[PDB]
Amino acid sequence: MTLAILAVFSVALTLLGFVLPPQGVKRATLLGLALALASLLLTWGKPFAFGPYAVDGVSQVFTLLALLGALWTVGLVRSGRFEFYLLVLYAALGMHLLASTRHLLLMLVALEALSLPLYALATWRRGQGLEAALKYFLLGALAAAFFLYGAALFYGATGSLVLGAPGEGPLYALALGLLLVGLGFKAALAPFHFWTPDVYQGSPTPVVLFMATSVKAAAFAALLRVAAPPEALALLVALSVVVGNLAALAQKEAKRLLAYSSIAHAGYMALALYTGNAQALGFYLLTYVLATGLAFAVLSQISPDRVPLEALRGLYRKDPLLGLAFLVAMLSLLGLPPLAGFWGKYLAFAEAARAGAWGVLVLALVTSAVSAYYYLGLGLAVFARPEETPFRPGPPWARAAVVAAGVLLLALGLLPGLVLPALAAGG
Amino acid sequence: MALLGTILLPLLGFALLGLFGKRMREPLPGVLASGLVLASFLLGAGLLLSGGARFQAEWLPGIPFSLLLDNLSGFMLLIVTGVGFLIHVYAIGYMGGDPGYSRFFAYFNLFIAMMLTLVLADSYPVMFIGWEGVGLASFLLIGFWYKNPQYADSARKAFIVNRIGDLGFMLGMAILWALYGTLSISELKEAMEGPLKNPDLLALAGLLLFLGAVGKSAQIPLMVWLPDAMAGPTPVSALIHAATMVTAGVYLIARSSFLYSVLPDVSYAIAVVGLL
Amino acid sequence: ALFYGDRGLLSGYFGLGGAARSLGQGLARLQTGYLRVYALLFVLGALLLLGVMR
Amino acid sequence: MVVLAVLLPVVFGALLLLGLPRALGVLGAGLSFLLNLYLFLTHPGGVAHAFQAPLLPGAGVYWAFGLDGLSALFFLTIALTVFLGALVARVEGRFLGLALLMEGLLLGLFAARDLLVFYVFFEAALIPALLMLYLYGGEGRTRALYTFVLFTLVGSLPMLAAVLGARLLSGSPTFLLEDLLAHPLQEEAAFWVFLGFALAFAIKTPLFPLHAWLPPFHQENHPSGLADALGTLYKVGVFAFFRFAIPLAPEGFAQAQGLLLFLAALSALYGAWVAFAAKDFKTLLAYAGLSHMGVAALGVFSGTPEGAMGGLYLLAASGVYTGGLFLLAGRLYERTGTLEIGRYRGLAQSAPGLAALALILFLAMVGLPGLSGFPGEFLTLLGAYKASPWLAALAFLSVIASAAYALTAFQKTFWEEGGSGVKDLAGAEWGFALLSVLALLLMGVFPGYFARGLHPLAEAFAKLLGG
Numbered sequence A: 001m002t003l004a005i006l007a008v009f010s011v012a013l014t015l016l017g018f019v020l021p022p023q024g025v026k027r028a029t030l031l032g033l034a035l036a037l038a039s040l041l042l043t044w045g046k047p048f049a050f051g052p053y054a055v056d057g058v059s060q061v062f063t064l065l066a067l068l069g070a071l072w073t074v075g076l077v078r079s080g081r082f083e084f085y086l087l088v089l090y091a092a093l094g095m096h097l098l099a100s101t102r103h104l105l106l107m108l109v110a111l112e113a114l115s116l117p118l119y120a121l122a123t124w125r126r127g128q129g130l131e132a133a134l135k136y137f138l139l140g141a142l143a144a145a146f147f148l149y150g151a152a153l154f155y156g157a158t159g160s161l162v163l164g165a166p167g168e169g170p171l172y173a174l175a176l177g178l179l180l181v182g183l184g185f186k187a188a189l190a191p192f193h194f195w196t197p198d199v200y201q202g203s204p205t206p207v208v209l210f211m212a213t214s215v216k217a218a219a220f221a222a223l224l225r226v227a228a229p230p231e232a233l234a235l236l237v238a239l240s241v242v243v244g245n246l247a248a249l250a251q252k253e254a255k256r257l258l259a260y261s262s263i264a265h266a267g268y269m270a271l272a273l274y275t276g277n278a279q280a281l282g283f284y285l286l287t288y289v290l291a292t293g294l295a296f297a298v299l300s301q302i303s304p305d306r307v308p309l310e311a312l313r314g315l316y317r318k319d320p321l322l323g324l325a326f327l328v329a330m331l332s333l334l335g336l337p338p339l340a341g342f343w344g345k346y347l348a349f350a351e352a353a354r355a356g357a358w359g360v361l362v363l364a365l366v367t368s369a370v371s372a373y374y375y376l377g378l379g380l381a382v383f384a385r386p387e388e389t390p391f392r393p394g395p396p397w398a399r400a401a402v403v404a405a406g407v408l409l410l411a412l413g414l415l416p417g418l419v420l421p422a423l424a425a426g427g
Numbered sequence B: 001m002a003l004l005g006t007i008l009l010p011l012l013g014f015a016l017l018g019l020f021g022k023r024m025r026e027p028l029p030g031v032l033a034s035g036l037v038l039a040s041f042l043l044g045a046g047l048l049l050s051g052g053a054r055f056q057a058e059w060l061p062g063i064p065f066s067l068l069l070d071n072l073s074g075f076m077l078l079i080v081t082g083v084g085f086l087i088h089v090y091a092i093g094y095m096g097g098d099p100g101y102s103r104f105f106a107y108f109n110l111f112i113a114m115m116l117t118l119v120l121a122d123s124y125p126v127m128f129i130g131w132e133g134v135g136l137a138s139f140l141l142i143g144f145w146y147k148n149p150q151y152a153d154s155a156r157k158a159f160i161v162n163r164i165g166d167l168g169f170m171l172g173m174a175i176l177w178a179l180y181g182t183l184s185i186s187e188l189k190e191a192m193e194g195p196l197k198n199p200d201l202l203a204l205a206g207l208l209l210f211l212g213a214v215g216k217s218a219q220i221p222l223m224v225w226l227p228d229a230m231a232g233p234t235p236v237s238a239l240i241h242a243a244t245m246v247t248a249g250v251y252l253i254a255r256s257s258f259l260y261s262v263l264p265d266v267s268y269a270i271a272v273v274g275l276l
Numbered sequence C: 001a002l003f004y005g006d007r008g009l010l011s012g013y014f015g016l017g018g019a020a021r022s023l024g025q026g027l028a029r030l031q032t033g034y035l036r037v038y039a040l041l042f043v044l045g046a047l048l049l050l051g052v053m054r
Numbered sequence D: 001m002v003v004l005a006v007l008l009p010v011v012f013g014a015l016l017l018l019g020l021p022r023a024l025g026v027l028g029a030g031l032s033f034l035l036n037l038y039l040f041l042t043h044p045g046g047v048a049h050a051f052q053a054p055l056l057p058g059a060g061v062y063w064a065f066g067l068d069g070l071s072a073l074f075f076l077t078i079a080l081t082v083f084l085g086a087l088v089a090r091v092e093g094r095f096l097g098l099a100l101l102m103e104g105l106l107l108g109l110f111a112a113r114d115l116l117v118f119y120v121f122f123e124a125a126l127i128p129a130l131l132m133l134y135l136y137g138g139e140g141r142t143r144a145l146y147t148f149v150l151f152t153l154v155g156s157l158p159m160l161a162a163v164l165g166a167r168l169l170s171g172s173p174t175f176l177l178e179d180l181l182a183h184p185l186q187e188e189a190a191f192w193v194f195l196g197f198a199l200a201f202a203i204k205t206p207l208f209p210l211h212a213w214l215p216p217f218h219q220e221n222h223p224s225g226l227a228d229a230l231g232t233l234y235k236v237g238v239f240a241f242f243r244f245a246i247p248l249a250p251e252g253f254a255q256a257q258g259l260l261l262f263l264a265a266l267s268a269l270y271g272a273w274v275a276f277a278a279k280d281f282k283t284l285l286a287y288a289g290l291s292h293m294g295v296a297a298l299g300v301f302s303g304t305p306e307g308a309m310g311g312l313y314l315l316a317a318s319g320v321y322t323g324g325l326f327l328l329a330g331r332l333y334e335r336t337g338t339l340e341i342g343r344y345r346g347l348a349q350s351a352p353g354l355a356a357l358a359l360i361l362f363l364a365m366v367g368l369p370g371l372s373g374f375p376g377e378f379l380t381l382l383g384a385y386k387a388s389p390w391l392a393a394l395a396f397l398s399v400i401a402s403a404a405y406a407l408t409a410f411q412k413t414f415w416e417e418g419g420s421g422v423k424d425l426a427g428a429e430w431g432f433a434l435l436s437v438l439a440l441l442l443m444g445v446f447p448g449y450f451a452r453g454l455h456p457l458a459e460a461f462a463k464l465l466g467g
């Protein structure tokens, strides 16, 4: 069991870290995350259902990606406070739980499980980081409230707290909306997205990597479990796409622009929800976690506290492979062939049109074309003349990370018939 | 094939003076030029004396490549190649000590070849290779001494004002295709035996054909280009004004006689513009 | 005349560009940094999504 | 066979990007040229060398390739044009690799036997296009780039809505062109799909209000203008209409057709008209291209096998002499230093029969019979007059403007008063001249052989608009 590995490592490391040096604890959390991940790969196509806990294809893929985000984020954070790894383990397990049940209340517990330690991880103790933590926490707790009242109304309109319960009339709908509020907030869909820019700009960069990838992943995994209605789906989409890209235009800072980018991207991902294909969504999030993870690793190698866009410029001269991998990431996030990001976007759009949501789809496509403004403004900016810019040219660790994960992108752009065959049930 | 010889001779010849040309001493390009014109006049008049000649070959589908040498064509061929020949041999003299001997006579052979392609043609598009070709060769020759701004604009005006009429040629050419679907002067004549069809439209086609002729033979309103064609060397003016070019203006009417003879309205306008 | 006209056409397309720029920095101006504002826009939003479905 | 020919510039280009040097990639463009030419003189019918492989199946997406009469002609055209660009070059910052990459991308673009792969290549080719624009020249590189890129993509991404609808609303199993055609859309579905194809194809044609990206693009590329030639080979709009937009949603094409003929016509006239005012070879050639595409699109839009064949042919052959004029503009740029037409007047007598080469090209452009432009222009006229005579005439108030800009520019660049002097012709530039003029003369004198394969496609995809 993956849950077993995560539980064991977390509880153990809590007290073991008193007897272990911080670095040794990093080795620990790394090994544990890796073992959870490996356990996942070895049971690919097991479906293991326990109590409310249920590991199927969705749980597998989305916790694979989430664990990948935990792994990468832990890699970069040598800073010695063993809790600043522990909490990442806590969050990781929590995200797994979130992706692994249809039980509304366990889901709530999982949401708190992952989002409580993140409020703490927003602390590089920077005055701006504290602001981020505060916003994230207040808005978070309110969203929590809405999700809970939604669960109580779900249990209202049906005898269960489990999603998959048959479902009434009005009260059922009201319940689903009240759930979509909290879940949507957690995936940064409009109009529940406000926290994202402030939190991404405010939090320490590697932490932000962890958020924008793992959190979003688990969030969408949990969204697949909801019976999300066409109307609400349309609203969330249109708003998230528009606000995402358009606001992203006005951004002069890197991290914040990437936050807005993530809002638009959540918008695109929600299209898969129209059919709730999950094979599409899985693929899309594979490409997204890869490219975003890359982008944030690169943005880490510049500055943790904050990065202006000018800093990106000249990156190629400094490190050729980070320049190239960053460009590739920008193109895959653009959804431009032949890159995996294009296949993800296509696979979501495909479900939108299959569902027959045409106006929404087109809108998404138009503003997606708009998004080519800012994705290029980074990837190209790689080749510009360097402004005096901070750069710590990374360990073999991070260079091979960004490079490999980057190569994976166009690897799956050429051959999506590699990974796509089974992002499904595992066959 | 031999009929095509008459055209190819002042071209296989022309190309040598452009490709090489300066590789030769300065009685020579005139001798080659006039020699090919000599044995175009000659070895085309043999064909005329043999009764006539033909050529039909591969081109765009439905619009074949046809040269007809009959009496009306032979007459023009003899005028063009004969008078042209004399003017060539003269040009050997009047052009002397002038660099671009090769340029001059290459352009001359080009001109002759184009004019022959014009008169020896059984389909309007090949005739059009003729028209645009002769206009082009006129342009090259009018602006022969190119180092002059005036003697460049001269040729510019030539190949523009002429193209105004060439446009009419094209239009009428398309009308006589939507209508009949042959675009070959012979079968376009043989299909115009009978009641005709849409005589108003046919009149339009003939009228645009005429508005084509106007430019090439410098009739009004396109009169204005010809006086400025004086710019090039004198024997160029001789060829353009007498043995070639403007002759095609009349010749097009003469071939398209089957078309104009059934047009009371249009022929009237043609005669009036002629007199004016 | 038509050349400079065409220049004006391209200019107008750029105008659309600036329209998206304007709208964009208008939507990004919605985030003041004030948490109370975020809460207001939030509750408002929830009311909106809820208003759409049933 | 086909995939080899599509990949050959791609690998050679890739071997060039990192590997270097130029020559090994120039003989790469030569190898692609000889291969594509060999491919032109061989194939019997429409299928030719088929290719089918799974890509995303379950999505309906397959790697599908093959050579119509059309595809073969374009493989020849493109291979030739790019090869000429390669041996002439004088760019050769070793991004001739980017050039070959874009070549392979375009070759795939025309060999594409299924819709989604076509889309893939259509957008993928944008990558080299945008790169060699950014990192290889121009003061206004960035604005030209974001304009070009945003334009093509704002047209493009909503086409994806249509390419999906093309298959989904028709109940077609896969994205294969044949299958998609075997399942017709109904009205107000065919309307929308055709429209979605049509914005992306008109903007990439380009048609009148949608052409504004074209002049900035052609100015800011490297002054030699290899990227300009390839940009002109990326002008695949008309072809895209003919092969894809029209047959898949003809019911809609019927409604749009008047407007399309209109925009094509006035695009031709307008383009050639403002082409006069251009004070640099880049802008001039750009608007000239707008004119030509106006004509081509007019040819296709007419229905009429004649007009369609003419338009496709015109596109094909205009690739060569437009690309050639671009390259030559670059070659007199390199020896002078500016693409300004006015400065450095008389070049003839300083230069050899370079005047001859440039003039031959300009005459091909204005469409002098015996040169490549005229056959296509002419068949186009033939078909247009059938469709709408008045727009045929309006659009053909063009040849006047063409002679105008071409001869004005030629005179002021070559014919007038002697300047400083120049180089004569390079050993490469001679291959350029010879091969080029050979091509122009062959396609202008034997438009019979080229476009034989265009015939069946023309009349069949004309009867498509019939019963």
Ligand SMILES: CCCCCCCCCCCO[C@@H]1O[C@H](CO)[C@@H](O[C@H]2O[C@H](CO)[C@@H](O)[C@H](O)[C@H]2O)[C@H](O)[C@H]1O
Pocket: B015, B017, B018, B019, B020, B021, B022, B099, B100, B101, B102, B103, B106, D348, D349, D352, D353, D354, D355, D356
């Ligand atoms: C299949 C084989 C193909 C054959 C077709 C080739 C024909 C090409 C000829 C085109 C025009 O050629 C023309 O003659 C020559 C050739 O260098 C050039 O002229 C130059 O050399 C000549 C030679 O006497 C000098 O007198 C002259 O001052 C100089 O301008 C001129 O620039 C050009 O405009």
